[PDB]
Each structure stands twice: as structure tokens, then as C-alpha cells.
Amino acid sequence: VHLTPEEKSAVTALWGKVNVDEVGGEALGRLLVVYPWTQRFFESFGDLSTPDAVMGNPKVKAHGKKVLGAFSDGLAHLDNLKGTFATLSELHCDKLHVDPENFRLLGNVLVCVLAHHFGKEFTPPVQAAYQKVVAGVANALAHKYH
Amino acid sequence: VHLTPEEKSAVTALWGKVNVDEVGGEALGRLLVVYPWTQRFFESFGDLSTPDAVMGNPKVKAHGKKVLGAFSDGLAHLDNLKGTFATLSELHCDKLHVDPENFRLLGNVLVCVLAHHFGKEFTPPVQAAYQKVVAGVANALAHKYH
Amino acid sequence: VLSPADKTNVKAAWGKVGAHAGEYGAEALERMFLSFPTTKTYFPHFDLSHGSAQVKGHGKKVADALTNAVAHVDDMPNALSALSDLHAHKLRVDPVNFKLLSHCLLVTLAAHLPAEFTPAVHASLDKFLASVSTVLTSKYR
Amino acid sequence: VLSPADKTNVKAAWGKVGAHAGEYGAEALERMFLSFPTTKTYFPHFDLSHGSAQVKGHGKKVADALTNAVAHVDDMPNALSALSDLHAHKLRVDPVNFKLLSHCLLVTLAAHLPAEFTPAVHASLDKFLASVSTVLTSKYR
Ligand code: HEM
Ligand code: HEM
Ligand code: HEM
Ligand code: HEM
């Protein structure tokens, strides 16, 4: 995660606007909806039968909240992503056993949700800046896989 | 690249048998043959029209030789793979622009070639040990991609 | 495969894309180049700078191939038959690069159609672009 | 797609696999579990230790599904129709895991058929296993 100073302005200024309550749920939900196999890990979340049941499930909106917490956090620790996620890495890695590829799928949805909410403000440059971030996190989380 | 001491014995003992001249060419060639798009990077290697033309091309056997050099090398520097490949990373990365995914495809073929030559000796445990190695290299080479 | 619910969702959101079709097409492109540099290697004779009329003309070209797909969905293979040879035989495009464009294509749509881009339709397009990708990389398998 | 040259190569090397079919099937399995641990999560009720009769019985099961594929290649979708629902609907197997098995499957064949595993056939099987994978993950797209 290098990030030039004007890529910094992009990412930063945008983040401070994100509804940090709803957005986190919008992404985890579309994940289960668009990439079904991921549901395998949240069976204990209740009925995940329709995109409606999923977009409405409280466990979902209550989990994405946390998930976005890990991003905000990461976003203010780009210097060291590995450290920040060592605990989470270990967890998703030698405990849940999530294929690291799903971290990239989650980052990309998160990116779609951000494009969804800011429509035109989310320009290509702001996206390119954010794609680097999603890649950084996705790799820190999969570090325990070595 | 952690590698337990008996995984070490596996990898090591096997390597010292590999025909370090032919094997390197066997892998780069089957790569171009099984994953065609990779040919895009070796047009200057001459006729790569048939699996025969490819398996017989001198540039090929002359390049795999080097490629295996980078593995032997890596194999005796597991402790630090990133450093060993910093130069090669930079090259394949911001110069040739090879999608890091192709490093994993090359590692897997290399693994098939090794199973091919040692048949039964190449047991699952020796393969599992070698799969970790191919993964290590494939990630060191893609480091400049951050 | 694509379910009837899917091809109805695809047909609607694309309907809504309307005449901005060729525009969104140049926007996905630009997005991919900036986010995934490694893709620029296929467009040397292109001036990939922000205003490139070349990038523009290609975007129109991309949109149209996608429009040809929606209006013949139940039979894409035969329809993109030609673009298959071109991308797989002549250009040798890495298959990974299709997943990167399909993405910038969904990010372009989502940033233009806030009302339609619902999770359901979001999933339908993704299958559509996945199927379109498989056809173009068919001449590999 | 698979070319006639491909389906002839596949039909030959599998012919050569003969009765060791169910055996090579249990070998791929064992190889995948050891190389890619993350896959063991689908076989809890299985004792994935080296001699598991369970792993054995499944291997026979896997070989047979592959044999059913070679002998009906020009029509796998309809043939693996059923295994599609099972792996995609009921088990929700991550699609990535098919690429990992197809690999241990080629490493198992290569270690048993030195004479046949030529680059050409190597490429043909890879397309075959790729196509088999697409069918089983069809009920996703
Ligand atoms: C960018 C990637 C991701 C981030 C930042 C992330 C973050 C988190 C965090 C912070 C937790 C809760 C930790 C706690 O409660 O202390 C968690 C738990 C979990 N994650 Fe993720 N996660 C990611 C990707 C995924 C993916 C792709 C899956 C796979 C489908 C997944 C499956 C799980 C599950 C099931 C839990 C629940 C753990 C429990 O039982 O409490 N996560 N994740
Ligand atoms: C495990 C991964 C790989 C290793 C260890 C490796 C190693 C090497 C080495 C040592 C060189 C020559 C450097 C020199 O002459 O000083 C090289 C060059 C090159 N590599 Fe690889 N390589 C890898 C993967 C690939 C892949 C997947 C492609 C993509 C198709 C590729 C494309 C190239 C090309 C075209 C060159 C020729 C450079 C020239 O013009 O001299 N390599 N590689
Ligand atoms: C959604 C999938 C895609 C579709 C539907 C698509 C469609 C097209 C079409 C219609 C053409 C022009 C055909 C003609 O009028 O002669 C074309 C050309 C081309 N495409 Fe794509 N394309 C896609 C993805 C890609 C990707 C992933 C790459 C690589 C980044 C790629 C690289 C090219 C190149 C290099 C050309 C030739 C441009 C030129 O020489 O002017 N395409 N594509
Ligand atoms: C080459 C592709 C594969 C083929 C042809 C295949 C074929 C089969 C067949 C025939 C069955 C048994 C059906 C029956 O008799 O009821 C089955 C079950 C199963 N497969 Fe696969 N499979 C493949 C890949 C995978 C992968 C990638 C995974 C995950 C690692 C997976 C997970 C399972 C599980 C969990 C079962 C159920 C086992 C049980 O409950 O006893 N399969 N597969």
C-alpha cells in the first residue's frame, strides 16, 4: 500500500462520508447474494434464502458493521496492514479456513457499494486509489497462509 | 515458507536428482502449450505453433534452464524469498507486466513435470511440501505489485 | 446458465442504460486501465489518456458487443463466435483480464443507475458478464 | 469446447488408466487434502488419514463420475446435471476448490502414466477437467 498524497486525499475525504452503519451491511449481504457459496460460513445467521431475507437479516447488518470497522482501522494504518490484521488473519485462516480469494471478492463488492452510494463522485481515480486499498487488506488477511 | 524438517528432507533429497538442464525446459514449454496466452510473452522465441515446435524450440530449453536456476536459488534461501527475487519481481512486474496469476500456473506445471519424472517417488507428502515452495516463490515474485 | 429471472433483470437494467451505452463502455475501459495497469499492455497503439477518442471509440465498440449479447442471450456462443477467435486466437488475452473488466463494468453501472442496481440485478449482471467472459475464452478450453 | 484431437487424447489416456480408475481417484483426493488443507472443511465426517476406507470409497466415486464424463463428453451438462445441484446447491463448494482438485488429478495421472502424459495430452485433460469443473459450478452462473 504505497498511495500517493493525492490518492490519499481521494480515499480519505470519501471515507469520512460513508454511512459506517449501513454500508458495512450492504457489502456483506451482496456478497452472500452474489457469491452464494459464501453463505456456507453464516448458516448460523438464520434464513438466507432470498436476497430480501438476506438484505433484511439483522445478523448481517450487525456483522458488516464490524467488518467495516476493520477497514476504517486498516485505512488508518496503511503503513502496517499485516500487523493490524495478524489476529484476524489467524482467525479467518487456521480457524474458519476461508479461501483467500474470497477476501478479494469482498473487497470488490465493498467497492461497488461505494460506487453505488456516491455515484458520480466515485471517479476512476478514486476507485483506482481504493482498489489498491482493498488489495492491501486482502493480502494482509491471507498472510497467515504461508 | 515455514517447512518442517522432514518436509525439508523431502524437498531437498528430491531436488538433487532433478535434471537441472531438461526439466527447466519441460516446464516453460508445457506452460506455453497448456496455457496459450502465455505465448504472448515469447513471440521472439520463434515458431511456437505446435506442441512439437514448442517442445523442440532451443530458446525454450535455454530459458527454462535459467528459470530453474531461480528455483534452485530460491530453494536455498527460503528464509528470505522476497529479497532473492526483488530484482526478478521488479522485472516481471513493472517491466513485462505478467499477471501474478501466471506465476502460480508455472509453479503447478513445474510440479507436474516433477511428478512426471519421479512417478511414484513423488508422493503426496513430497508434493504438499513442494506446493508450499511454489506458492512461496509465486508470492515473492509478485511483491513489487503493491 | 442464467435463469429467466436473470435474463429479465439483465434486459431491464440494460434497457435503462439506453443511449449512454457506448459512454458507459468507455468509462469501464478507463476505470480498468487506472485500477489494473497490467491491462494497458494490450493497448499500446492507444493513447489511454483521459480524453482519448480512441478509448472512446472502443467503448462504443464494447457496449455494442454487450448489446448484441443481451439481445441474443439464449444463444451467445454462436453470437460472439467471432469475438472469441479474436480475443483468444489473435490477441491471446489473459483470461484473468475479463474478470477485471467485468468488475469495472459493474462499478460503472452502479455509479449510474442507483435505482436499478439492486442486489438481485447486481447478481444477474455478474452472471451475464461471467457468461460473456466464458464465451470469449471458450476458444481456450 | 474440446476439439476432436482433445476428446481422442482424453479417451486414450483414460483408457490407459483402466481399472486403477477408482485408485487414482482416491490418490487425487489424498493429495488435495495434504497440499490444500483449506479443502478438508468439506469432509468432517471423513477420517482423512492415509488409510481411510472412506477416502477410498469416495475416490472410487470420483473416478466413476469422471468416467461417466469421458463416455458422454459431447454432452456433459445433461450428464452431470445431477452432480451440479449437489455440489452447487446443497454443498455450496467454493468454485476455487475445483481448480485445486483438477490439479492433483493431473499430478496423479502424470505419476502413473509416464508414457502417455505428453504435453499434448496434458493440455487435453486440463481442458477436460476445466469443462467438468464448469458444469459442476454451472448452477452458480
Ligand atoms: C476483507 C475481508 C474481511 C474482513 C476485513 C473481515 C473482518 C471480520 C471481522 C472483524 C470478524 C469478526 C471478529 C470478531 O468478532 O472479533 C470476522 C468474522 C468472520 N468472518 Fe470476516 N472478514 C473478511 C472476509 C470474510 C469472508 C470473505 C468470509 C468468508 C465467507 C468471512 C467469514 C467470516 C465469518 C463466518 C466470521 C464470523 C466469526 C464468528 O463466528 O464470530 N469474512 N470477519
Ligand atoms: C515462478 C515464476 C517465474 C520465474 C522463477 C521466472 C524467472 C525468470 C528469470 C530468471 C528470467 C530471466 C532473467 C535474466 O535473464 O536475467 C525471466 C525472464 C522472463 N520471464 Fe520469467 N519467470 C517466472 C514466470 C514467468 C511467467 C509466468 C511468464 C509469463 C508468461 C514469464 C515471462 C518472462 C519473460 C518473457 C522473460 C524474458 C525476459 C527477457 O526478455 O529476457 N516468466 N523469468
Ligand atoms: C467484456 C468482455 C469484452 C468484450 C465484450 C470485448 C469486445 C471487444 C470488441 C467488440 C472488439 C472490437 C472488434 C471489432 O470491431 O473488430 C474488441 C477488441 C479488443 N479487445 Fe476487447 N472485449 C472484452 C474484453 C477485453 C479484455 C479483457 C481485453 C484486455 C484488457 C481486451 C482486449 C481487446 C483488444 C486489444 C482489442 C483490439 C483493439 C484494437 O486493436 O483496436 N478485450 N473487444
Ligand atoms: C472433479 C470434480 C469433482 C467431481 C467429478 C466430483 C464428484 C463427486 C461425486 C460423484 C460425489 C458423490 C455423489 C453420490 O454418489 O451421491 C461427490 C460428493 C462430494 N464432493 Fe465431489 N466432486 C468433485 C470435486 C469436489 C470438490 C472440489 C469438493 C470440495 C473439496 C467436493 C466436495 C464433495 C463433498 C463434500 C461430497 C459429499 C461427500 C459425502 O458427503 O460423502 N467435490 N463428488
Contacts of A44 (CB under 8 A, 6+ apart): A59
Q: How was this structure determined?
A: X-ray
The answer to whether residues C98 and C136 touch, using CB atoms and an 8 Å cutoff, is yes
Q: Report the alpha-carbon distance of residue D37 to residue D29 in Å, rounded.
A: 11
Residue B58 has a CB neighbour count (10 Å cut-off) of 10
Residues of B in contact with D106 (CB under 8 A): 112
Task: Report how far apart, in Å, the C-alpha atoms of A3 and of each of A6, A10, A11, A105, D106 are.
Answer: 8, 10, 9, 21, 41
Q: Report the alpha-carbon distance of residue D107 to residue C63 in Å, rounded.
A: 42
What φ, ψ does residue C5 adopt, rounded to 5°?
-60, -35
3-state secondary structure of C36: coil
To the question of whether residue A92 is assigned a binding role by annotation, the answer is: yes
Give me the residues of C, 122-141, that contact D with CB < 8 A: 127, 130-131, 134, 138-139, 141
Q: Answer yes or no: do B37 and C93 touch at CB < 8 A.
A: yes
Reported as half-sphere exposure (CB side, CA atoms, 13 A), residue B6 has a value of 1
Pick from B21, B28, B69: nearest CA to B45: B28
Q: Which CATH number is associated with domain B1-146?
A: 1.10.490.10
Residue A74 has a CB neighbour count (10 Å cut-off) of 21
Q: Report the alpha-carbon distance of residue D113 to residue C50 in Å, rounded.
A: 54
- For residue D110, the CA-to-ligand 4 centroid distance in Å is 22
Does the C-beta of B107 come closer than 6 Å to ligand 2? yes
CA dihedral in degrees (D69, D75, D79, D83; nearest 10)? 70
- For residue B71, the CA-to-ligand 2 centroid distance in Å is 12
The answer to whether residues B33 and D6 touch, using CB atoms and an 8 Å cutoff, is no
Does the C-beta of A103 come closer than 6 Å to ligand 1? yes
What φ, ψ does residue A112 adopt, rounded to 5°?
-70, -40
Could you tell me the domains of chain D?
A: 1-141 (1.10.490.10)
The answer to whether residues D139 and D88 touch, using CB atoms and an 8 Å cutoff, is yes
Q: Report the alpha-carbon distance of residue B139 to residue B125 in Å, rounded.
A: 22
Q: Report the alpha-carbon distance of residue D20 to residue D66 in Å, rounded.
A: 13
Which of A139, A143, A144 is the best mutation test for B, with the most CBs of B within 10 A? A139
- For residue D93, the CA-to-ligand 4 centroid distance in Å is 9
DSSP conformation class of C16: H
CA angle A22, A28, A29 (to 5 degrees): 85
3-state secondary structure chain D: CCCHHHHHHHHHHHHHHHHHHHHHHHHHHHHHHHHCHHHHHHCCCCCCCCCCHHHHHHHHHHHHHHHHHHCCHHHHHHHHHHHHHHHHHHCCCCCHHHHHHHHHHHHHHHCCCCCCCCHHHHHHHHHHHHHHHHHHCCCCC
